Design an enzyme around this catalytic site. Structure first.
Site, PDB file in Angstrom:
ATOM      1  N   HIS A 270       0.776  -1.241   0.000  1.00 51.03           N
ATOM      2  CA  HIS A 270       0.000   0.000   0.000  1.00 51.03           C
ATOM      3  C   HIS A 270       0.817   1.306   0.000  1.00 51.03           C
ATOM      4  CE1 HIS A 270      -4.033  -1.826   0.619  1.00 51.03           C
ATOM      5  NE2 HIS A 270      -3.375  -2.737   1.315  1.00 51.03           N
TER       6      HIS A 270
ATOM      7  N   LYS B 108      -8.883  13.996   3.935  1.00 49.61           N
ATOM      8  CA  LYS B 108      -7.962  12.845   3.975  1.00 49.61           C
ATOM      9  C   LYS B 108      -7.089  13.047   5.216  1.00 49.61           C
ATOM     10  CE  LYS B 108      -6.671  13.961  -0.161  1.00 49.61           C
ATOM     11  NZ  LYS B 108      -6.469  12.755  -1.024  1.00 49.61           N
ATOM     12  N   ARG B 109      -6.397  12.002   5.656  1.00 49.63           N
ATOM     13  CA  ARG B 109      -5.494  12.129   6.810  1.00 49.63           C
ATOM     14  C   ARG B 109      -4.413  13.205   6.582  1.00 49.63           C
ATOM     15  NH1 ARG B 109      -5.754   8.118  11.091  1.00 49.63           N
ATOM     16  NH2 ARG B 109      -3.880   9.225  11.836  1.00 49.63           N
TER      17      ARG B 109
ATOM     18  N   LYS C 299       0.737  14.526   1.397  1.00 47.29           N
ATOM     19  CA  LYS C 299      -0.566  14.853   0.812  1.00 47.29           C
ATOM     20  C   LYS C 299      -0.710  16.354   0.520  1.00 47.29           C
ATOM     21  CE  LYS C 299      -2.881  10.832   3.000  1.00 47.29           C
ATOM     22  NZ  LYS C 299      -3.713  10.216   1.896  1.00 47.29           N
TER      23      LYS C 299
ATOM     24  N   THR D 155      -8.271   6.590  -2.750  1.00 42.02           N
ATOM     25  CA  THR D 155      -9.630   6.102  -2.985  1.00 42.02           C
ATOM     26  C   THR D 155     -10.640   7.230  -2.784  1.00 42.02           C
ATOM     27  OG1 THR D 155      -9.761   5.274  -0.710  1.00 42.02           O
ATOM     28  CG2 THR D 155      -9.235   3.651  -2.439  1.00 42.02           C
TER      29      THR D 155
ATOM     30  N   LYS E  51     -14.296   8.413  -4.965  1.00 42.57           N
ATOM     31  CA  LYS E  51     -15.567   8.809  -4.346  1.00 42.57           C
ATOM     32  C   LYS E  51     -16.071  10.154  -4.880  1.00 42.57           C
ATOM     33  CE  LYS E  51     -13.820   6.714  -0.030  1.00 42.57           C
ATOM     34  NZ  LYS E  51     -13.392   7.013   1.387  1.00 42.57           N
TER      35      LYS E  51
HETATM   36  O1  LIG Z   1       1.690   2.577   5.839  1.00 48.16           O
HETATM   37  C1  LIG Z   1       0.827   2.374   6.697  1.00 48.16           C
HETATM   38  N1  LIG Z   1      -0.493   2.511   6.493  1.00 48.16           N
HETATM   39  C2  LIG Z   1      -1.065   2.865   5.328  1.00 48.16           C
HETATM   40  C3  LIG Z   1      -0.410   2.735   4.089  1.00 48.16           C
HETATM   41  C4  LIG Z   1      -1.075   3.110   2.919  1.00 48.16           C
HETATM   42  N2  LIG Z   1      -2.394   3.599   3.011  1.00 48.16           N
HETATM   43  C5  LIG Z   1      -3.183   4.002   1.823  1.00 48.16           C
HETATM   44  O2  LIG Z   1      -3.803   2.773   1.343  1.00 48.16           O
HETATM   45  C6  LIG Z   1      -4.864   3.079   0.418  1.00 48.16           C
HETATM   46  C7  LIG Z   1      -5.534   1.757   0.037  1.00 48.16           C
HETATM   47  O3  LIG Z   1      -4.636   1.021  -0.810  1.00 48.16           O
HETATM   48  C8  LIG Z   1      -4.307   3.795  -0.843  1.00 48.16           C
HETATM   49  O4  LIG Z   1      -5.394   4.236  -1.658  1.00 48.16           O
HETATM   50  C9  LIG Z   1      -3.374   4.984  -0.512  1.00 48.16           C
HETATM   51  F1  LIG Z   1      -2.652   5.355  -1.633  1.00 48.16           F
HETATM   52  C10 LIG Z   1      -2.418   4.667   0.661  1.00 48.16           C
HETATM   53  O5  LIG Z   1      -1.756   5.857   1.118  1.00 48.16           O
HETATM   54  C11 LIG Z   1      -3.010   3.685   4.276  1.00 48.16           C
HETATM   55  O6  LIG Z   1      -4.164   4.108   4.381  1.00 48.16           O
HETATM   56  N3  LIG Z   1      -2.332   3.320   5.380  1.00 48.16           N
HETATM   57  C12 LIG Z   1       1.232   1.935   8.119  1.00 48.16           C
HETATM   58  C13 LIG Z   1       2.551   1.539   8.373  1.00 48.16           C
HETATM   59  C14 LIG Z   1       2.939   1.127   9.651  1.00 48.16           C
HETATM   60  C15 LIG Z   1       1.995   1.113  10.681  1.00 48.16           C
HETATM   61  C16 LIG Z   1       0.679   1.502  10.434  1.00 48.16           C
HETATM   62  C17 LIG Z   1       0.299   1.911   9.154  1.00 48.16           C
END
Ligand SMILES: O=C(Nc1ccn([C@@H]2O[C@H](CO)[C@@H](O)[C@H](F)[C@H]2O)c(=O)n1)c1ccccc1
Ligand SMILES: O=C(Nc1ccn([C@@H]2O[C@H](CO)[C@@H](O)[C@H](F)[C@H]2O)c(=O)n1)c1ccccc1
Lengths: 811, 811
Positions: B352, B543-544, B549, B651, B655
């Site tokens: 991801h 978004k977060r 971002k 994503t 939406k």
């Molecule tokens: O990287 C971490 N956590 C992430 C990584 C990527 N993502 C997102 O995933 C979405 C679904 O594929 C994508 O649309 C986005 F492009 C991507 O940023 C997300 O929401 N959390 C993470 C790493 C260590 C501990 C906790 C979380």
């Protein structure tokens, strides 16, 4: 099947079956192909619960419309046991549910065994609260039980290598179908902080907040359509609690620990901070709820005592007194004197023991930090109270010291019993002898100042749980002769005196006992793989393990019988099964050693080929309400052998009387009144009276004297010392021998000779089954006084100022 | 009322009303006189839940009889949001429930707002899992979601003095009507201990045990009568745990803390022990359950991969690989090579992100203590893998170092991504550009060794939640033209291209947007007392909060617009409402400063009399799934402005496209494929491409250059530095200025000029409502590729080896 269990009408059975199937499908989300007996239990419990709800809603609506005086029973313990059968009994649904489940291919009694006990108490005090709730509903009183919803109740006891092991009582694991969470009525409770003085009175500020969330459980009366409420509080952290981030969320546990676990001490005081927090938590949440309900009724606190009674079950909720003062003075802005009048007229206090180690005496430094405003209020109560003492008894400086709520010494303490007496309009003991001892000894000074406050209310047990539920066979043979009205008017059992020479009745009483003994003998083999002779006399002592209750005296008799058999193997003796059961507080070393001793005796006695099946000694593991319901109906002999003046009442004693066992006992607690009711010729009384104990104390108790003059006693002590009952660890029981010989507060040796002789008289009568049973009939027939319905009617009339009602609410 | 919401037949409405009344009475124990809106919500939820149960039982029975290949989706996050409306939609009950509640005098939309979000995820990754579950059920796959039942989900965000504050998300406080506890299927999980070597293999001994108790939640497919399961594990201590007594009971909290709280990190790795425990807990319980279900099917593990697929959602459940090996080798006694074959064919891995700080790299010393046997297994996997690398690339010593699962250095670490690639038969990225970047950069070495493993599966969103549920008005005007089939076959939206010149349709599309904006403008005033002009362009970035971002680039544009207005107050500008929302991880300082900056800009802009209502800046508090459902349908402009090569897919972008907003974005993640589908002329693309970023990196990024050559940018930086946006604390934003000027990994200044120019082109088109709407129609019409039904059909066919089915199960 049997009459007292009600009707099984075609319409009712049909509806029960369909609602059972509905719950299995919709509530449990199971089909018949995958369902287990536990699923079947839950489907039945939800089906029975449905029958409670309409009556519950309309009972509470009735109280709102009629606005009667409300009774609030505050207790840290409610020892409820199982709920399914009790609910069926009180709703007259038992036969219908039995038929319905039978038609679905299920055994209802098997389903009943699946339910966990609600084990939210230690023993007598907690079980009393439970019998009281049942009687209050049966007598149509607008009554509410208030306590704590412990996540973990009294521990499950396992016996490993003869030793007690404790396991967490995770009673909520599978859910509790009986309770309803009421998160909407959550209330804040304050701790710590400091007191600020303004021009407009004291303010308690900078506090920590814990939320109190209520869970309500229905309490059905017997066939009167009344359903009262038991409201139990659960601790929750506020959402901004401690608000790095992860740890702050994890630390919510600190707040929520308040309702985590029941302290497992029975008749013993441990001054731990967490216990003080529990006591304030229940009091603070409960009082807010009471005041809320009072204001929403139908500003004037003069009428508060006309609409509210608060009963304190021991001193555990004693903080209700200064908390009520705090609310009235600090928040409602009443003058001190008026607030105090209201408080006194509202509160009443029940004392449950005279043992000094059981009395709550809280260190001032604990109250100072946790409840600073309450300490200030307690000091002011004390000052005003001692001013009245000084005026009534001028110059009597020692009386002032003795009566103070503040105890001086190494650690300054608050005597909570003194606080309760000062702030209550009624103080009661729990049996006639106990209530007299209170006035003559520990509360003599208070009785002299305010004689009108002191009352007696002899304890009782509910005849629903303790006869109809646990002993349907006996209930049925009684009903066959005198009808069913005795179930809520137990004084009607006197009518049975007319049948003491009735050959049919004598045979039926004896038959029911044999059946109960057979059932219990089978239970033991099935669940514990332990064999017993069902033709032997069932000699039973079940109650919490304590030195004052003298399980040790019982042990000495057991060893005496063993030694006599070994001496004369070919002499006939009446065969006995001696059963002892009860839990020991985890920190009480001597009580744990006593359990080990009992199992150790069994290890020798039960495997001696010469003894055969003439003597068996069994320790009954995990004694609790559900087990009491099984063993009590099976008992022949009830052991009630506390040192005179130590057991305030007892209630186990009353359960045995109602269920057709004879009693061997001292003239202690309610034993005195039981013997008075049945006639002393129909009881097996032995030993020192209270006056005899006092005489021995004046002289000085010397255990060596008895050891020197009684050869049979000497032999036993020598056996214990030498390792006869512990060959691998010869000195295992040295602590027990030492205590007995040098430090015995309860004078075990002093009653030994009279006890052994009395036990011989028991064996003599048991040899004559017809005369044994006639004496049993005389006991059952005169057990009526010991119904908790009698007890509650007396509290209602003499303390709460309300009249009981046996009248039905419309169904 | 509207067609897509189904039928409201007299029979159905009548039944719904009666079952609503039944639940209020029997389940909630309330009458209409005392019931609150929350009680009414619960009565409705139980009524709707009842409709799920028959289908749920028969779906699971169907899978047992047919015995298809089962799909197991393992995730530490499931961001589910609310359940009531989604359930009604998928069961075709919305209009019937609306009518039934209307007839009872209740407003259903008001009841819907009472439900808590199930906020068991952080953002994109967790919401993806949720859309996937919906699509898997809709496509008739025998699929199970497995995760953790967190007591506390993602924190509730409050904004205080412009700063983020965190509050515990106590989502279970009032109960969860959707879940069913299954304490009967509780499983043990082992931690710590040591490894013993016997003549018959390794043994993991002396462990601590934590119990995993499952709770099942139904997952309904769209109108096909399929109901799949999401099973979430909760941590419980065994009853003999730590078994002075009181403390041992209190210490149970230590075990149960495993499932207490969701770690609130989004795209960032924190190597905490509690997080490792969570990851093993879910993996160990889940694998036991999978194996149990496999054995109970209908000994031969050769067919295991034919009946089981496990999908790893990122590396969070990567321990499934060595855990499966452990079970097969140590417990089932398979030879290593056979176990490994089974493991590889069973497991697949979805990546991801490419950001280095997000990659899980666990210190060896943590695994050594917590999971000693797993470390041994990982070492053996590594040895055998590197032996294959050495054989394929002889002499290439640096490749061996680069590919090792064990990372050497100060602290020895395990690279979990490397473990996942080695132990999976398929590895996928989540958009075409991301999947290409994986093969070219971070996993280049692995791609060279095993090219066949690497795939793309472009992300998608469910058109049930993200169109029908949140935007019924738009769903209805579409259905009026092309029927209802597009709801489960979103490619049918292409048919709308025939209406781009249809005057009626153009008017209807614009009308629905205005209504959504009016509704949202009203929501803001009601719930937050914030005023907005509903005629302005709604410019939305939700978004977060993360530096990659580039909420900061948005901030720079906002200040540019403000400065231009102040320069020429009497010039016409297209009015905008700029809305930014999202949570910051509690420990991420820069993200917290960015939130403060946004509110600080609003404080200046929103109260400047010269600006009027031509520009408003609003921070949207507590962004979560329920809020997304409200704001997305109201948006005109979707901000998707991550630095090229940093957002793997996105994503939120999809939406917005589905709901009639135009997109301003970089050529990053799925933006590339969205522009390709709609046509580049119908998108607002700006800025550096991936290749441009690489070129700048080679040269060295110098932010000073941009500051020196762009006067409008210089002004903004000078305003931030001097305290224009923080007059009381002039140096408040110095950390932000410093980062921007000297340490900006994401090249904010480099895209500033192109961004501002592109934004001018947006304002130009918005001045022409008809042409704005025609471009919108071209976007909605080509959004079909982005249905998660397409995504799941590709996983099914290309990874799991199963065929989707749109066929109904019998009702
Ligand atoms: O990287 C971490 N956590 C992430 C990584 C990527 N993502 C997102 O995933 C979405 C679904 O594929 C994508 O649309 C986005 F492009 C991507 O940023 C997300 O929401 N959390 C993470 C790493 C260590 C501990 C906790 C979380
Ligand atoms: O003394 C304590 N706890 C007690 C005290 C008395 N009791 C019992 O109460 C029964 C009901 O009246 C009587 O029948 C008995 F006579 C009496 O012993 C009991 O079961 N727990 C105690 C003290 C401090 C802390 C905890 C418990």
């Amino acid at each position: 099947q049997i009459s007292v269990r009600g009707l099984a009408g075609v319409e009712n059975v049909t509806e029960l079956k369909k609602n059972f199937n509905r719950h299995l499908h919709f509530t449990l989300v199971k089909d018949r192909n995958v369902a287990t007996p536990r699923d079947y239990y839950f489907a039945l419990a939800h089906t029975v619960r449905d029958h409670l709800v309409g009556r519950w809603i309309r009972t509470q609506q009735h109280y709102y419309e009629k606005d009667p005086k409300r009774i609030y029973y505050l207790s840290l313990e409610f020892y409820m046991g199982r709920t399914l059968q009790n609910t069926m009994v009180n709703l007259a649904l038992e036969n219908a549910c039995d038929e319905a489940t039978y038609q679905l291919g299920l055994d209802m009694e098997e389903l009943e065994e699946i339910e966990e006990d609600a084990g939210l108490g230690n023993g007598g005090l907690g079980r009393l609260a439970a019998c009281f709730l049942d009687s209050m509903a049966t007598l149509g009183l607008a009554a509410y039980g208030y306590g704590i919803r412990y996540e973990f109740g009294i521990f499950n006891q396992k016996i490993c290598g003869g030793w007690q092991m404790e396991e967490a009582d995770d009673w909520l694991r599978y859910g509790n179908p009986w309770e309803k969470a009421r998160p909407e009525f959550t209330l804040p409770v304050h701790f710590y902080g400091r007191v600020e003085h303004t021009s407009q009175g004291a303010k308690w500020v900078d506090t920590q907040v814990v939320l109190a969330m209520p869970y309500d459980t229905p309490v059905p009366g017997y066939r009167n359509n009344v359903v009262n409420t038991m409201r139990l509080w659960s601790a929750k952290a506020p959402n901004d609690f401690n608000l790095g981030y992860i740890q702050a969320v994890l630390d919510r546990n600190l707040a929520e620990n308040i309702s985590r676990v029941l302290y497992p001490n029975d008749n013993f005081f441990e001054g731990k901070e967490l216990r003080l927090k529990q006591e304030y938590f229940v009091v603070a949440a409960t009082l807010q709820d009471i005041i809320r309900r009072f204001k929403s009724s139908k500003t004037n606190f003069d009428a508060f005592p006309d609409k509210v009674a608060i009963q304190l079950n021991d001193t555990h909720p004693s903080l209700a007194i200064p908390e009520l003062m705090r609310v009235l003075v600090d928040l409602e802005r009443l003058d001190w004197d008026k607030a105090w009048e209201v408080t006194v007229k509202t509160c009443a206090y029940t004392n449950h023991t005279v043992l000094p180690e059981a009395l709550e005496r809280w260190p001032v430094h604990l109250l100072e930090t946790l409840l600073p405003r309450h300490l200030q209020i307690i000091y002011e109560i004390n000052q005003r109270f001692l001013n009245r003492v000084a005026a009534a008894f001028p110059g009597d400086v020692d009386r002032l010291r003795r009566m103070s709520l503040v105890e001086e010494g190494a650690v300054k303490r608050i005597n909570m019993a003194h606080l309760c007496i000062a702030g209550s309009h009624a103080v009661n003991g729990v049996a006639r002898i106990h209530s007299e001892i209170l006035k003559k000894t520990i509360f003599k000074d208070f009785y002299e100042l305010e004689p009108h406050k002191f009352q007696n209310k002899t304890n009782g047990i509910t005849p629903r749980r303790w006869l109809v539920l646990c002993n349907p066979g006996l209930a049925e043979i009684i009903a066959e002769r005198i009808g069913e009205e005795y179930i809520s008017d137990l004084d009607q059992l006197r009518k049975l005196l007319s049948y003491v020479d009735d050959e049919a009745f004598i045979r039926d009483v004896a038959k029911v006992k044999q059946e109960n003994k057979l059932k219990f003998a089978a239970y033991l083999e099935r669940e514990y793989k332990v064999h017993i002779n069902p033709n032997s006399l069932f000699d039973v002592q079940v109650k919490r393990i304590h030195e004052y209750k003298r399980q040790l005296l019982n042990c000495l008799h057991v060893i005496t019988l063993y030694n006599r058999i070994k001496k004369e193997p070919n002499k006939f003796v009446v065969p006995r099964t001696v059963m002892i059961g009860g839990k020991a507080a985890p920190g009480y070393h001597m009580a744990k050693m006593i359990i080990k001793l009992i199992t150790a005796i069994g290890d020798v006695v039960n495997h001696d080929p010469v003894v055969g099946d003439r003597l068996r000694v069994i320790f009954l593991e995990n004694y609790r309400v559900s087990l009491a319901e099984k063993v009590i109906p099976a008992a022949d002999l009830s052991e009630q052998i506390s040192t005179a003046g130590t057991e305030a009442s007892g209630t186990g004693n009353m359960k045995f009387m109602l269920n057709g066992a004879l009693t061997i006992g001292t003239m202690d607690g309610a034993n005195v009144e039981m013997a008075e009711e049945a006639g002393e010729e129909n009881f097996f009384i032995f030993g020192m009276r209270v006056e005899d104990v006092d005489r021995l104390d004046q002289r000085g108790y010397n255990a060596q004297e008895y050891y020197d003059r009684i050869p049979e006693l000497r032999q036993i002590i020598e056996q214990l010392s030498s390792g006869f009952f512990s060959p691998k660890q010869p000195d295992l029981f040295k602590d027990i021998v030492n205590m007995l010989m040098h430090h015995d507060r309860f004078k075990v040796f002093a009653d030994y000779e009279e006890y052994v002789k009395c036990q011989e008289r028991v064996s003599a009568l048991y040899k004559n089954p017809r005369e044994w049973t006639r004496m049993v009939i005389r006991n059952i027939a005169t057990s009526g006084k010991f119904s908790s319905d009698r007890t509650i009617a007396q509290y209602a009339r003499e303390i709460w100022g309300v009249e009981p009602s046996r009248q039905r609410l419309p169904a």
